[PDB]
Design a protein around this ligand. Structure first.
Ligand SMILES: [Zn+2]
Length: 56
């Protein structure tokens, strides 16, 4: 499935799309990607829209 990550920072706004077999693996993907950017904080997930958000 296609999932999305919304990055909601004070120094960064954006989105990534990634492929993964399910949402636990997409999580693991997106936290690595968020680490690249330096962005961490409150993680949430919208099953309707297969989208994670991370909000600093
Ligand atoms: Zn696939």
């Amino acid at each position: 499935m296609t999932y999305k990550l919304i990055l909601n920072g004070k120094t960064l706004k954006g989105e990534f799309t990634a492929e993964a077999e399910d949402a636990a693996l997409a999580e693991y993907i997106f936290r690595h990607l968020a680490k690249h950017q330096g962005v961490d904080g409150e993680w949430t997930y919208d099953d309707a829209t297969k989208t994670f958000t991370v909000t600093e």
